[PDB]
Amino acid sequence: NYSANQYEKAYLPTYLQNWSPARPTKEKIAAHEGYTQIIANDRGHLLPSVPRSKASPWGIPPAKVTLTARTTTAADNLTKWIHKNPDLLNACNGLRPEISGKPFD
Amino acid sequence: MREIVHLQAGQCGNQIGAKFWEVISDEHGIDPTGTYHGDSDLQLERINVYYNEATGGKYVPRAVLVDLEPGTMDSVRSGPFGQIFRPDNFVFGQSGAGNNWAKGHYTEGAELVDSVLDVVRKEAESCDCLQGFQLTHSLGGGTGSGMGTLLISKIREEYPDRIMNTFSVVPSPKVSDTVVEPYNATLSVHQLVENTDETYCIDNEALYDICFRTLKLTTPTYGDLNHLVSATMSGVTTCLRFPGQLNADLRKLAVNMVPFPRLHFFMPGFAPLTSRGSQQYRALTVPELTQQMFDAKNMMAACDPRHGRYLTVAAVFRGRMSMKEVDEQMLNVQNKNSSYFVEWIPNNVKTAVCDIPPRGLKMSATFIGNSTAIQELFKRISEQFTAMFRRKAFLHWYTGEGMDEMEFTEAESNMNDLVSEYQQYQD
């Protein structure tokens, strides 16, 4: 799930025709010291001590908009009319749009 | 006189050698049957470096095929030059690999190493005085890692005075097919760094990119991938077989190439790769050769040391050249590319010229590089183990084979060393 090196043009949505960006990637790591012990028994059963992402994942009004210049009261509502929807903010292909704009005077 | 005996290991090496050996025979002009057609005296004279003599003008290759799967060796035997290969040299086993490093390293290797050592020593006694040995296999290869790591260890005590050339291909970083493929690598490279003196590192993704970049032909054969690496490995051997004012010994090369013992991993470089129109749209001159020789695209091994810096560089030029164009281009590439190299060592350029051009092109060359671009490789190699040995996935097999988690720990600690070594020396 890392991004490759140098020849960074042969794998892009240019060929995927992807209209929701795949996944953030990187080329970096802190030098990992560590014996890389085993904290499973036979099943990936974490030894009760070691922590994990403790049952976090287990298994329409939002839209890309620039606030630009539309009346602030409407603009204020839109921001709320975008957010407060974790059913479309969190996971399962990403579910998170973008936003832009500028205020009024 | 001094000769080289070859070892064919793993199924890739089965495809590698088949293309490599047909290149040599066709380069030297021997027919598929084996009756050499006398056309060049120099290739007539310097055939003894690699081949022995059979009756009726037959040049027996001094290579050894080892495998486990008959179909691969059945296929290559039916291949264009299986006839010039020896059933005496066809050694293999009665077992299936499972792509298992441990089975080919402790279980299956035990009963076959005896025979293969007999075969090579019979070949070793057949010849007079070897430079050393070269080895075609894969580091991610399931059984080639199994056999070679065993064999290289045994040869180390057998002949610790010869050249242990190793030719291995790095599997695709983005795509590995085999999932235990990383595990096989660290198992192998742990002994490899201990035993090898030379190691070529090659990756298929660049090969796809180069076929993309210059072959232009969309859909190649994997044999074409063999066909180009066979050309590269042949170029370094042109020095030995061919005349011209160039010193050819790999030790000659290695002592100029290896500043410190742990340096075994090297990247190749080759000469004109030409497109359909550019054959007649190219003015074949050493400068544009020198430009193409040093191209961020012309490389094929891992990636550009654009990330890092240059430690040692050695370029061999095959064809009708002169000492000045290489010198001024070296001066050109010196003044143009000076401080990217480590200030540790200046003038670490190593040049040799083979006056004898290849059969098909005249102005040609080969480059071998040792720069600071291998960090990303074993850095890449580093994470997945820490990811998968984190939870010992697919491990009950190797414990069943009699292996322990501990053996991995020194192997990774050994590579954890070499990350710092590559880092600390350059950075």
Added chain:
Amino acid sequence: MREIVHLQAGQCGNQIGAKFWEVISDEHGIDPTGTYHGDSDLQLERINVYYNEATGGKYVPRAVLVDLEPGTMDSVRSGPFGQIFRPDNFVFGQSGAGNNWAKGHYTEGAELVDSVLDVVRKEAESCDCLQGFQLTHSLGGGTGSGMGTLLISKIREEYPDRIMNTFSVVPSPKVSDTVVEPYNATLSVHQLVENTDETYCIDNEALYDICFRTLKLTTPTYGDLNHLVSATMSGVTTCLRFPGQLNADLRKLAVNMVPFPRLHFFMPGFAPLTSRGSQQYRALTVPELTQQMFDAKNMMAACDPRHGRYLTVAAVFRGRMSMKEVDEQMLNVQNKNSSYFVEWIPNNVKTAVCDIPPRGLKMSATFIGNSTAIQELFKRISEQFTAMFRRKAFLHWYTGEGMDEMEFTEAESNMNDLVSEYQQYQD
């Protein structure tokens, strides 16, 4: 030896270089296939100023084509001289632009500047010593403005020692078709005045009126407009390629042209333009040449300098002329309108004579002018920006790309500073 590498930018320059290069090939007598037909020697030695050598007597143009819309290049590649252009030099993008400056300057150029820099430095190293670079593009041209402003910002720090010629066409004052066109212009000119050393100013409306005036052929092709202008840059380049007692270096010219650093914008002038019947109703004499050479109707760049006064003037004469006729004609014009000059500098005339006439006409000349006629140009756009930045029409796109009005505020007074400057020196 001193040479030049050309740059094709924007889809306007897509017409230009094709027309620009074909004139040169016909001038030097190279067939469409590319095999030179030795007929004139002087073109045979002095072709290396712009061309390199390809095999079989083929002269490869040293120009770089870049764009985004594939259909443009395919038409150019299918043109009568697309074959002489290199697939290697064909660099482009996987996107359509939308004729948006910020996308072509921040979004799409990101992954192409790397490639184009490699190609040019490959070409730059392919040659020994350049005078500099010349660029065909437009200030009102979307993708060209995005690409060119990026590279001119780049090609300065690597090579701050060379001639950074820029050839840009000004859009039609009455209508710009594109409505965001001024937004593209203000951004481009802001970097342009900072980065360039030379800038040509060209307008199409004058070309349309000239067709009504001397061409008299009602309906031309826009290629004819390209063919007309290509003569203009040809003449200024005839200095370098041809012998004759005229000093050719554009720096030699530019130092004689540029009194103060921010003077980048110059107007051209061309020689005999002849109508339907007047070819043999014209007595080709330097007086009437000089007369027509200095005609407000013969002006073609932006508008009449009749509104202002004359800073610097330079006319290059191509053909069998001599020291005398250019002198008294210069004396005649000096006495003709002595007050129309600026009292700041007298004798602001700079003369060069090319003894080698073109192939098609004997008596010819090329004029480059720097007068006080650019005020109307940026004054005209000034009200447009104030009117349309008054309430930010069509601006949500650029903020979507990431733009904000501070860049507009900074750019505008740069132009306003030049308004006061261009006013202050003369008025």
Added chain:
Amino acid sequence: EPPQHPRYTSLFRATIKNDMKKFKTAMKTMGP
């Protein structure tokens, strides 16, 4: 104990050491 001979700077340290580094436009040229 042999004292190391004071390394005679017949230029060098001044020039030829700095001359090698000065005629160098590297860290720049193939690409970033």
Added chain:
Amino acid sequence: GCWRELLRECKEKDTDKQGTISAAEFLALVEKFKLDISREESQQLIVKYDLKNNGKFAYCDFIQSCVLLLKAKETSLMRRMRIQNADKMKEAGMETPSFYSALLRIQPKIVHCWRPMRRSFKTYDKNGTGLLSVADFRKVLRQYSINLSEEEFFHVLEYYDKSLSSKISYNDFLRAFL
């Protein structure tokens, strides 16, 4: 200098083995260099180390226990942690870094190139199975510039051996400094 300076801090003081350094004058080292130890911790230290080897503060344990001594394992590869248990369990000459002042001398050498000396041991065909001849252990030491004296030898024999010759395992030696 958590290893070097703190070592040098004691080497400034001079007394005999049992009389390590007076707790009051070790507080004079506290004013010679302010210590990260909390004031309450500072008070116990002068009396939690004077309990052994006279009212003199026992830097003998303190200095080495803080940095030199680590008689355990780790999660994070303390530069090797090979698995091994040969020479430490017996240990007739139980840990006494005053008697075993060689540990104070050798850690500088091993913090330099612990990995090559870690490499050095297995290079002697140790088979990766345990111990290795003592005389072979003697020659590996000096050969890598680790000059260790005969009296220092006698000590480490008492420490890394109990009954007879034995063959002192590699990591079992290593983990002392490691």
Added chain:
Amino acid sequence: LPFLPGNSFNRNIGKERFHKSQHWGFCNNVRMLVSENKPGVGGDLLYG
């Protein structure tokens, strides 16, 4: 054309028969090549 890299053009025309045989085998308790007469991939003739 020579056998240079990039000049290898495989016979990629209609290839409907692809049978494989077992040229080698084991037999008894030693190992050798089973009877020489063997067709190749899709019934291919051997060398001479």
Added chain:
Amino acid sequence: MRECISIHVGQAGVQIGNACWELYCLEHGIQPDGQMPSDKTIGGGDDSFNTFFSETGAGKHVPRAVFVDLEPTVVDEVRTGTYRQLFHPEQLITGKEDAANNYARGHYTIGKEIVDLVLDRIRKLADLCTGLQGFLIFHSFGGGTGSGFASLLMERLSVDYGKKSKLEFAIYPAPQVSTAVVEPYNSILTTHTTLEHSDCAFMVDNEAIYDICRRNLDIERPTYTNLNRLIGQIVSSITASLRFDGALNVDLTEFQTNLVPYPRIHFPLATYAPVISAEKAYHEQLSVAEITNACFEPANQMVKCDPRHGKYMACCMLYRGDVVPKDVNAAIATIKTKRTIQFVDWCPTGFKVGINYQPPTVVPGGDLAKVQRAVCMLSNTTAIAEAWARLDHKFDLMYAKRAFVHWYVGEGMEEGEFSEAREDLAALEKDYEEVGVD
């Protein structure tokens, strides 16, 4: 050499085996008599059949499978079929009494006195064979005779032979269709008995087989012949690596070592992408990209599971036909970028590619398409626990009111075995949850 033995237990598992052998003879051109034309492929039994048939100097291709059944009805019918002369009479094991859907009746009552005869068959087949990579076990969990009789034999063959593989194939119980209410009883009985011995068990569901039949094959009224034709193709595809070569060759040992992450669970799911009607194949085009999406399209999986509710561990694709490395490696790269595909983070790599040059052919009087590019998609995901979870509440309710127990305790069991299987199952779901907990 490279050969294996097939076993078909249960009169449910026999007709599917016949169709497989019926399929096999076509690609080899086997005449029903047992002999080739005057063309030369006979000998000591060494050609493409040497892994499948035994055509000795007698000249008759002998299939390397043993058919076992407890009722004489259907088993004699194939003995009166068209290829019965090919088959070995007492390889086609029959029985005179049934197990009446009872696992234990086939496991205890009759199974004792028949396995010894069967054990004679395997050893007399073991002596003649050379390579013996593994076995092909065709059964059914809700087996009237498939369930119980298989359990005893797999136990006995496991203990005497534990150095070789064994491949299990059973119809998975229909999630919402039940032809027997005792079918769950023995199904959990079968699962708990097989968890500690079986190597690789592959399940399939007929409802989705019918579902695809009218979806793209557009047959509203197919038959078993078509149903057996599909699964016979499936096992044919996996045996192409055996029967042919390709760009790379793989073996069952590579499968087992790489498909199963951890012990117990060895339950992958099969999928075959180029399943399309003849006309829909006629005026359309096939390539790796679209068939990769279709095999990854969730409704193309043969088991009633939503991958979006689960997460992927193993994925295996077998490309049989005309393909090239370039598109496939580029294609599979796209899926690695895909977001819906939720592999478990433990495996950056979870894909096993097999390339075979041979295009799959059509069967005369068949219903398949004209396949040039083929792929069999074998994968393992966490979305499987629902089926067992469906069984347990189905199982627990009837156990709570102990329905039909008086038969089983009547003919010789007690609740202890029924007790044990549930926490064996209860272990699975929590283990399936814990492994799903990455």
